[PDB]
Amino acid sequence: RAQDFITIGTGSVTGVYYPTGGAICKLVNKDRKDHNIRCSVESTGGSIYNVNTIRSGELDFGIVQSDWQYHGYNGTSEFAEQGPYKKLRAVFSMHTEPFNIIARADSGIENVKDLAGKRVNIGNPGSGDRATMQVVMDAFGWNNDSFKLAAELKGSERSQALCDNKIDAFIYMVGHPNGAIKEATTSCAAKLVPATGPEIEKIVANNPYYAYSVVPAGMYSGTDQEVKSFGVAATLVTTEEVSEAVVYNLTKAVFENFDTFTRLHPAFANLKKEDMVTAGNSIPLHPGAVKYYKEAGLIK
Ligand SMILES: N[C@@H](CCC(=O)O)C(=O)O
Ligand code: NA
Ligand code: NA
Ligand code: NA
Ligand code: NA
Ligand code: NA
């Protein structure tokens, strides 16, 4: 854990986490001559890899879905074999990430229940995509054999596979707009498919980090009505092992430059400082973040 160099783990290069890490690092790096922190971004497999690799020491921060923030801390669900990681700390939360289904026009897939018996990219092993897909799979009584093909491509390979007719649909736990879904919809005629019904309703009712989501009509070519699903929040997490001064300066960089931050990616346009402190954060805030929030009056 260096005091003067930090690495943020994100996701595939055509998702939202990757440019989010870039935006955070830009706001840290602009004052590196003062606080001495150089911030670097890594593209990664996603939430699960990010938690595990903060733990093993190679990442200082990671962008992690609110459900895997909770389970990574507690050593539950996807993290059960790894055991608890009670040093994990929240920093702030960010944009909403719906459970998106992106299907071929000819796929016959009109809702989440239609994924069974199709070629479905359920997600790569390090991703929040695959881990939250397992939750959906649980709700339906599905296993990997419920699909004709349970493909595990990382995010930046999914649109090509869908358009090349190697899968009927891919799922993606991701904010909007993003490049992967823009490509599939605007260059290969894919559709965004809702996830509704009693199984999704149970998922939302039974968990505080799953809430109903809506993608508006016009977000993407060809999706001409709004699309309902459920969603999580993207969150920035770290470890107690990272120094309070480092987390303080990173948190201050984002919040004291909030009007700039919310101009850096269209997914950030409607963030609210107060919600960023609490929403989607179910584990202790890092003391360095708390220190800034108390200075700013966001925590009394
Ligand atoms: N939530 C996805 C990443 C989404 C993104 O890259 O923006 C994951 O944890 O795998
Ligand atoms: Na899992
Ligand atoms: Na809920
Ligand atoms: Na603004
Ligand atoms: Na507004
Ligand atoms: Na909270």
Author numbering: 29 to 328
Tell me, in the authors' exact words, what the paper reports.
Tripartite ATP-independent periplasmic (TRAP) transporters are a large family of SBP-dependent secondary-active transporters that are found exclusively in prokaryotes to catalyze the uptake of a variety of substrates, primarily organic anions, across the cytoplasmic membrane. A defining feature of TRAP transporters is the obligate utilization of an SBP, which is either found in the periplasm or attached to the outer leaflet of the cytoplasmic membrane, where it binds and delivers the substrate to the membrane component. Here, we have characterized VcGluP, a TAXI TRAP SBP from V. cholerae, the first experimentally validated glutamate transporter identified in this pathogen. We have shown that VcGluP preferentially binds glutamate and can also bind glutamine with a micromolar affinity.
To investigate the selectivity determinants of VcGluP, we solved the structure of VcGluP in the presence of excess (0.5 mM) L-glutamate to 1.7 Å, using molecular replacement. The refined model obtained in the presence of 0.5 mM L-glutamate contains residues 29–328, which equates to all of the 299 residues of mature VcGluP. VcGluP is composed of 2 α/β domains connected by a hinge composed of antiparallel β-sheets (residues 116–131 and 255–267). Comparison with other SBP structures reveals that VcGluP belongs to Cluster F. In addition, each domain contains a disulfide bond; Cys53–Cys67 in domain 1 which connects a1 with B2, and Cys191–Cys216 in domain 2 that connects a8 and a9, although density for this disulfide is missing likely through radiation damage. We also identified three Na+ ions bound to the surface of the protein (purple spheres and Fig. S2), although due to their distance from the binding site, we predict that these are functionally irrelevant interactions and merely a consequence of the 2.4 M sodium malonate used during crystallization. During refinement, we identified non-protein density in the cleft between the two domains, which we assigned to L-glutamate, which was present at 0.5 mM during crystallization. As expected, in the presence of ligand, VcGluP adopts a closed conformation wherein the two domains completely envelope the ligand binding site. Analysis of the ligand binding site reveals that L-glutamate is coordinated by VcGluP via a hydrogen bonding network composed of direct mainchain and sidechain interactions, and indirectly through coordinated water molecules. The α-carboxyl group of the bound L-glutamate makes sidechain and mainchain interactions with S75, mainchain interactions with G156 and hydrogen bonds to a water molecule, which is itself coordinated by the D157 sidechain. However, we found that binding affinity was only severely diminished when Y45 and Q93 were mutated to alanine, reducing the affinity by 213- and 990-fold, respectively, suggesting that these residues are the key binding determinants for VcGluP.
